[PDB]
Design a protein around this ligand. Structure first.
Ligand SMILES: *[C@@H]1O[C@H](CO)[C@@H](O)[C@H](O)[C@H]1NC(C)=O
Ligand SMILES: *[C@@H]1O[C@H](CO)[C@@H](O)[C@H](O)[C@H]1NC(C)=O
Ligand SMILES: [Ca+2]
Ligand SMILES: [Ca+2]
Ligand SMILES: [Ca+2]
Ligand SMILES: [Ca+2]
Ligand SMILES: [Ca+2]
Ligand SMILES: [Ca+2]
Ligand SMILES: [Ca+2]
Ligand SMILES: [Ca+2]
Ligand SMILES: [Zn+2]
Ligand SMILES: [Zn+2]
Lengths: 276, 396, 276, 397
């Protein structure tokens, strides 16, 4: 009602707890499950969606509300990922050679990003503060940078010759680039097949959980080397059969949704802050 | 009230002074006052009321005078005096109980029981003598339109209240900026908590303000100001304002910064204390304003530097607290306190006799509800019953 | 915020005005100019973007703050339009034959929308209230409608013969369909090339203005026939050369931004919020 | 106070009654009172005024008694009496001014000037006689703590407050639901405005509520309630609560619906008026609750229907008003009102002599500050200075 303003809220201790609202949210919320193709392959049952829907029905969710979205692999899913359900759960398979790419994907979907358009053919770009990154996604995004000085001359590079530009991304499907702050960088990006955006990490995205399937603690959703936080929405599971993984996800869905929350940036209260 | 107090004081003096072996000169004035009381009460019928479970009682006075002609009081004298004293004490206690369980909205300071209204008649004014107790002295001064004050050790001026205000919040309750406070009795514990530790605040300072509006003015108040709030210095799981969910509080205590305690009267600053802790004196105020700041420590050792990251998640929430204890004060009106038994006596008498709820006080004489809505009618009734309770305490 | 949305705002009618907030607004905001490709063709220059940025720099906008996004024409631009900057000014060329289309684009751009998926093959649908519309976008939308009755038999249509369906759209890139409320309609849409969504109009979109270059006032952003409102964000300019159009846009940018607010830019650039 | 009032009363009676040619039997009692005053005051030194620019004045009394042998008053008798009266009136004026410019936190009801303190002594109590003025009568009743009563035509019971509350708002300020009110003096103008005209309200009803808490209880109050609020019925450009921007208010007035006036004492309903306009009586209250609904009219002529569309933009905003005027009331505390001059006289004396700000009253006797924080100590000091101002007005005015 008073949408554009942040009015302080006064709460009283000893105010009685409301009853559990888990049943109501399960009855009014949509749960998108994201899994890789190899999961469906190994399961090898064309009716498994119906079985999972019935199991969720036993666990509370109405049998029209759980969605299953399939992606090929981590690198492909990272291109313009779109998580539209009330609650999104991503079964991300672990690979020892894709640690940075898993970290980038989680950082992109476990946190809320406010992205402004980048025109590297028009402007020199600079990162203001520690929350400001350059997020680029596409079929193949290769990014080279030239850090400039106060006189606009390049440092260790020449603005005219792009071959000297320091290379920070090669043939990436998603890459979050962090450079020194306050220094203007000329950017050479393969814009033809990938978009770069100047983004700010507003805060967590609480309606998205990532379960790392069969790896170790490697995700780094913060560019600061001194911090490697393990939020409640980044789980890890050992596995041999994808059926057991899905069974665990169903059986502990109460716990999973507990670790998440309705997208704060969403819903009517957020109106006139950024979205809805 | 003055007459009831005089009766009680006479009886208390007679109990304390009419003792075997004592010189009559020690008690002569008291014996004159006692005989005056007997003369004034003789021939009068009184009825103490049947309100609640308090029984109807009828009182008759046909007592003889105490002797005056001995050099030293003897055992016979003490026994004769005690017989009359016991009856008078019973009557005064019953009148006090009958007055303590009654209330009026239109005129709550005037007597309510029939016996006390009868005793306010001019025919009983002869009983009146030394009005030396604090409550009766205040009563007389207030009837004279004179400035008088009750002295309270740990006055119960603050209604009980444990609440919080969230100035920055979100549905997940993980980047919260706000205040937690307990106002209880004579004690205030306040604490400003910032989860981001003012990482992204102007000048790296987060300001907290807490205003407590006292329902009555306090004067010559001795107050202890301590720079931390132990009530909000440990991990807590706290309901949300609607109680829909529960959030997590994980304090790490920093020194409060720019601590400014203002004691204000009519919106004007009377006393101001900056970065002062220990004993302070609030001479006259109706409001307490506590300003304090969480200042991000410019330098941090690695153990400290870890606790406060540049961004979320925030696991260690930086809290700065103040504690304000009113040790002693003076009030125009009557109040409960840690030393006096007036409230406890009134409540006990109201409970023992199943006194229904009236149009003045809250049920059970609950002090929080009473002090929250301290209306003039409530004040009048409450001073009346407290004076009567003190008068009863002289004998019971 | 969300815990203080439903709380009053008390203000005195004697509080002092703050200073100008235009300087801070321009220093901290992004401006996106959406123009038709024919505009850049008529300019014929390849550096005109730089010149416009420099001219804006005299109006207080920093260098890397104004952005120029090109679109072919009204039809293509209406295929899932994306709004990128804090302030979005759409220079739309007027065409007598595309009036409704222009209106639809305006309706999709000057108002906020909340859309749910529509499955026209498995379910019938209806529009609950005057804010409930059906918005469909894509390569080519051909919407045919069969109204039903309480018995779920078509009125002037057959549920089995789609040729008898009443056509409301043909070869559309963006169409907003408003049907009679409270009636279940069977829907035939070329879902292969375009997608239809059940949308609700929430309110104005304050950060997007539409400047109609040439023509007259023809925009109608409300389905109601009894109202054709012209808001402050719907401008019109007569034109002969596109350089003059861009110069009048740059010079009076203060007036344009005064008609907009920076409190509608959502996290994503979509012209509508989407829920499952 | 009673002695100062009695002095002034005797002097006023002497001015009115000691007139040429009058029967001595018209003034015999007044002559006795005047002579008793002269006897009591003779041989006493007084000093008035050492605060601000109020000069130090010294007063000595050595006067002869008025004669008692005449049957009718002649010119010489009246002139000698007038000489004595003029000196006494000057003295009483100065004592009143000296008392009015002083205040005390402790015993504000007690005298503060040294002359009135001296007049409080036993020897001067002989001067005391008929205490019939409303202010001195209330003073004597308050000394004994009997139920006081001050009658006020248009009591100044509301501090000035012109503000608004927004219940529905957003940064564009084009779909606003809220209330705006001027509470000033004895008047409350309030108006609830919904920009959508309750199009999407639950049954097309928008409920508005306004609570006014009086700093003193009023009794026997005649109140006019008029449906409209002319103060909030014309186009306005209004600051935002933070003052950052300005919003627009283009009201169109609809009659308020289900109008309910509630007069409450200690949070309990005393008087309730439903759909009643004109003169009403609030017998005893300290709070006013005005609740009123904007009801969207089900049937509209084409112009009316064009005023209020189904959705934004909303150009004509549905506003429902209320005007509340306390015509006359009774209060157990002193108050400024439209008819009297006590506040104006006290303020005028304090300003005329540059009386410094004291620990009791606001920085210059601003009534808004006083009534907003009308504390018991302030009430005592104000009753004292107002009684003194009335005593002075008996003679100086
Ligand atoms: C909440 O739970 C309690 C106990 O199970 C029950 O009495 C009550 O009806 C429930 N519902 C609500 C709305 O409180
Ligand atoms: C506003 O402008 C005035 C006049 O230029 C200046 O004095 C003031 O400091 C500025 N800022 C504020 C917050 O008033
Ligand atoms: Ca990568
Ligand atoms: Ca190089
Ligand atoms: Ca950086
Ligand atoms: Ca890290
Ligand atoms: Ca047909
Ligand atoms: Ca179309
Ligand atoms: Ca419709
Ligand atoms: Ca229309
Ligand atoms: Zn909360
Ligand atoms: Zn506003």
């Amino acid at each position: 009602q008073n949408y554009g303003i942040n009015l302080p809220i006064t709460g009283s201790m000893d105010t009685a707890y409301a009853n559990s609202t888990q049943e109501e949210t399960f009855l009014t919320s949509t749960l998108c499950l994201y899994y890789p193709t190899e999961a469906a392959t190994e399961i090898n049952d064309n009716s498994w969606k119906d079985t999972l829907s019935q199991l969720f029905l036993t666990k509370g969710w109405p049998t029209g509300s759980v969605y299953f979205k399939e992606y090929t692999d981590i690198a492909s899913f990272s291109v313009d990922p779109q998580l539209y359900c009330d609650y999104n759960v991503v079964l991300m398979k672990y690979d020892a050679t894709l640690q940075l790419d898993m970290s980038e994907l989680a950082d992109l979907i476990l946190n809320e990003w406010l992205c402004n358009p980048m025109d590297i053919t028009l402007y020199y770009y600079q990162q203001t503060d520690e929350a400001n990154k350059w997020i680029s996604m596409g079929s193949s995004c290769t990014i080279k940078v030239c850090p400039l000085n106060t006189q606009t001359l390049g440092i260790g590079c020449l603005t005219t010759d792009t071959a000297t530009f320091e290379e920070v991304a090669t043939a990436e499907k998603l890459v979050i680039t962090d450079v020194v702050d306050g220094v203007n960088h000329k950017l050479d990006v393969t814009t033809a097949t990938c978009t770069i955006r100047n983004c700010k990490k507003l805060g967590p995205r609480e309606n998205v959980a990532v379960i790392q399937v069969g790896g170790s603690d490697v995700l780094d959703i913060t560019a600061d080397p001194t911090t490697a936080p393990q939020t409640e929405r980044m789980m890890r599971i050992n596995w041999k059969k994808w059926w057991q993984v899905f069974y665990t996800v169903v059986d502990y869905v109460n716990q999973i949704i507990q670790a998440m929350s309705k997208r704060s940036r969403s819903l009517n209260s957020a109106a006139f802050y950024y979205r809805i | 009230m003055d007459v009831l107090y005089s009766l009680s004081k006479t009886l208390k003096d007679a109990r304390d002074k009419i003792v075997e072996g004592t010189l009559y000169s020690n008690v002569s004035d008291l014996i004159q006052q006692f005989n005056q009381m007997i003369i004034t009460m003789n021939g009068n019928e009184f009825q103490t009321g049947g309100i609640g479970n308090l029984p109807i009682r009828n009182w008759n006075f046909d007592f003889g005078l105490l002797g005056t002609t001995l050099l030293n009081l003897d055992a016979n004298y003490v026994e004769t005096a005690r017989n009359t004293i016991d009856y008078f004490v019973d009557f005064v206690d019953n009148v006090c109980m009958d007055e303590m369980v009654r209330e009026s909205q239109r005129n709550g300071i005037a007597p309510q029981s029939d016996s006390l209204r009868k005793l306010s008649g001019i025919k009983f004014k002869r009983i009146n003598f030394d009005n030396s107790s604090e409550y009766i002295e205040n009563w007389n001064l207030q009837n004279r339109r004179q400035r008088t004050g009750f002295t309270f050790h740990k006055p119960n001026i603050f209604p009980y209240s444990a609440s919080f205000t969230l100035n920055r919040s979100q549905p997940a309750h993980d980047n919260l900026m706000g205040t937690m406070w307990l106002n209880a009795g004579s004690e205030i514990q306040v604490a400003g908590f910032d989860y981001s530790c003012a990482i992204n605040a102007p000048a790296n300072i987060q300001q907290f303000e807490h205003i407590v509006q006292l329902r009555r003015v306090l004067t010559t108040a001795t107050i202890t100001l301590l720079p931390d709030a132990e009530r909000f210095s440990f991990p807590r799981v706290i309901n949300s304002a609607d109680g829909a969910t529960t959030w997590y509080f994980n304090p790490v205590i920093l020194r409060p910064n720019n601590v400014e305690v203002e004691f204000l009267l009519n919106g004007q600053i009377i006393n101001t204390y900056q970065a002062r802790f220990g004993t302070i004196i609030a001479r006259n105020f109706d409001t307490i304003r506590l300003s304090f700041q969480l200042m991000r420590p410019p330098n941090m050792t690695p153990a400290v530097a870890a606790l406060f990251p540049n961004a979320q998640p925030f696991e260690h929430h930086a809290t700065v607290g103040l504690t304000l204890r009113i040790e002693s004060a003076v009030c125009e009106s009557v109040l409960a306190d840690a030393s006096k038994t007036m409230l406890a006596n009134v409540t006990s008498v109201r409970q023992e006799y199943a006194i229904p709820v009236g149009p003045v006080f809250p049920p059970g004489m609950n002090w929080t509800d009473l002090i929250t809505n301290y209306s003039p009618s409530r004040e009048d009734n409450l001073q009346r019953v407290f004076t009567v309770a003190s008068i009863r305490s002289m004998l019971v």
